[PDB]
């Protein structure tokens, strides 16, 4: 694909989602389709930490590094 | 027992009721449809439900022949 | 397929420009775009320039060829107001 995700392993993950949601956490794993496994995850309120999650790639709208985690 | 479309095909030449997402409902006599739920109605009367300044109001239109794009359709049943 | 057109988008904003490489899905690439906002109720309007615009096809509602010059003169008798005012007004209107 286009972005090699190996580089962010156990690095802060900041993740925007289709419905307005934003999620941050450390990368643990992935699939070819950018389904993601995140640990230590905090989700953001748009008009809160639960830690462990699995995010659907289909719903991903943007991803970047965060100083936050 | 057939897929829901077949039941819809059972209604051809009959009065059908169609519900749209945007607070609009139609009732009329069905003439055609595809699997995308695009529809041709032959003597329909549309009715629109609104929110005006804390009161519910309903204006309505009728027309002889109208194609109606399926992706707006939320439900179908008999008048 | 090198024409000057207007486009109205799903969010309600109007873009104007000259098209290229468009319509396989109707996805469009425009040059020298202009976003124009009208309020006929106050004889005002507003502009801001858009150089090269790429548009994803699910966001276009409709488009069509225009003659810019014929549409200008009406432009003339109206007061161009600041773009900022129009954006704030528009959110008020919508």
């Amino acid at each position: 694909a286009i972005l090699d995700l190996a580089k962010y392993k156990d690095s802060k993950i900041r993740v925007k989602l289709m419905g307005g949601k934003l999620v941050i956490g450390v990368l643990k794993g992935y699939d070819q389709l950018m389904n993601l496994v995140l640990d230590d995850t905090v989700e953001y309120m748009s008009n809160r930490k639960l830690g462990l999650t699995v995010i659907r790639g289909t719903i991903l709208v943007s991803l970047s590094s965060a100083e936050g985690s | 027992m057939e897929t829901p479309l077949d039941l819809l095909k059972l209604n051809l030449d009959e009065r059908v009721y169609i519900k749209l997402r945007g607070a609009r409902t139609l009732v009329g006599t069905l003439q055609a449809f595809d699997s995308h739920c695009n529809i041709v109605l032959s003597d329909a009367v549309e009715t629109i439900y609104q929110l005006n300044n804390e009161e519910l109001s309903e204006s309505e239109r009728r027309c002889e022949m109208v194609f109606i794009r399926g992706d707006t359709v939320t439900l179908i049943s008999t008048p | 397929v090198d024409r000057k057109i207007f486009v109205l988008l799903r969010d309600g904003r109007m873009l104007f420009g000259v098209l290229r490489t468009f319509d396989q899905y109707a996805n469009l690439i425009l040059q020298d775009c202009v976003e124009r906002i009208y309020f006929s109720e106050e004889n005002k309007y507003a502009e801001e320039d858009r150089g090269i615009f790429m548009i994803r096809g699910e966001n276009v509602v409709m488009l069509g060829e225009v003659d810019i010059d014929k549409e200008d003169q009406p432009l003339e008798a109206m007061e161009r107001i600041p773009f900022k005012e129009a954006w704030l007004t528009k959110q008020k209107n919508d």
């Binding site: - | 095909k9 059972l10 209604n11 051809l12 030449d13 009959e14 | -």
Partner: protein
């Protein structure tokens, strides 16, 4: 619709399917697979309170698909269907709607549906009884209508009353040459009259009815007079008819209580004149 109307819609769409292939088999195919379509009409099947064909004959698309379905049919199948219509004629949900007795105020739509069944099914029955009939089979059809229904109930229905007119008229229109048949006809004719004899002029519709229809458009009663002319054309018989309807003739002739829009008074006189010219 004693059945579900889920059921009858199934049926009516199955017949629509089957006749859609049989028509589609004209790119060459073994065309007469009508043995597969007929079984869907349930004509033979007396497994219900009302025969499923008579039921789907109530729906609009049923009546609309009758000319096409008759195309792939074989007289004695065509005759089997026409016998089914007559034998259960009082079960037709469009006999009900033409009757003023049962459906006193019929929505404009229901008036329309009556007009449709009229234009399509009568054409079929008037045609089949012209280019495809035996005198004795006309006897059979007629006799069937009599023995299985509350005759004169039907005389209130535009459809039934018109139907009766068709049976009789086409029958008596066999004045051409070429015995016991003649003997049989007398017997039926006498048998029909009795039921009507007391109840003729129950035919003519109540005033409110006419008022309700009249409000929905513009009453053409030419179908009533055409009937009375048909039944007349049995001398004492002629007397009884001209008796119970006399005052209605006296009222209708008095009906022309107006002389001098360009109102079409010609129409009303023509109907009664069509009766009297006949007999």
């Amino acid at each position: 619709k004693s059945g579900g109307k889920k059921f009858i819609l199934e049926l009516i769409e199955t017949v629509y399917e089957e006749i859609l292939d049989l028509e589609a088999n004209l790119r060459n195919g073994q065309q007469t697979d009508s043995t597969a379509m007929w079984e869907a009409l349930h004509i033979d099947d007396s497994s219900y309170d009302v025969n499923p064909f008579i039921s789907m004959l109530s729906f609009d698309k049923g009546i609309k698909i009758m000319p096409r379905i008759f195309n792939f049919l074989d007289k004695q199948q065509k005759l089997k269907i026409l016998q089914k219509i007559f034998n259960e004629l009082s079960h037709l949900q469009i006999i009900i709607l033409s009757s003023y007795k049962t459906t006193p105020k019929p929505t404009l739509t229901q008036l329309k549906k009556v007009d449709l069944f009229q234009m399509i099914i009568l054409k079929i029955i008037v045609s089949f009884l012209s280019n495809n009939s035996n005198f004795i089979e006309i006897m059979g059809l007629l006799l069937q209508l009599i023995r299985n229904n509350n005759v004169s109930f039907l005389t209130t229905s535009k459809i039934g009353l018109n139907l009766i007119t068709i049976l009789i008229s086409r029958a008596a229109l066999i004045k051409q040459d070429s015995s016991p048949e003649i003997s049989t006809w007398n017997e039926i004719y006498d048998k029909l009259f009795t039921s009507l004899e007391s109840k003729i002029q129950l035919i003519f519709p109540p005033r409110e009815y006419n008022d309700h229809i009249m409000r929905l458009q513009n009453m053409d009663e030419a179908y009533i007079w055409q009937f009375l002319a048909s039944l007349a054309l049995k001398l004492n018989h002629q007397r009884i008819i001209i008796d119970e309807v006399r005052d209605e003739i006296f009222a209708t002739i008095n009906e022309a209580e107006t002389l001098q829009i360009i109102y079409n008074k010609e129409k009303l006189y023509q109907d009664l004149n069509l009766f009297l010219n006949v007999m």
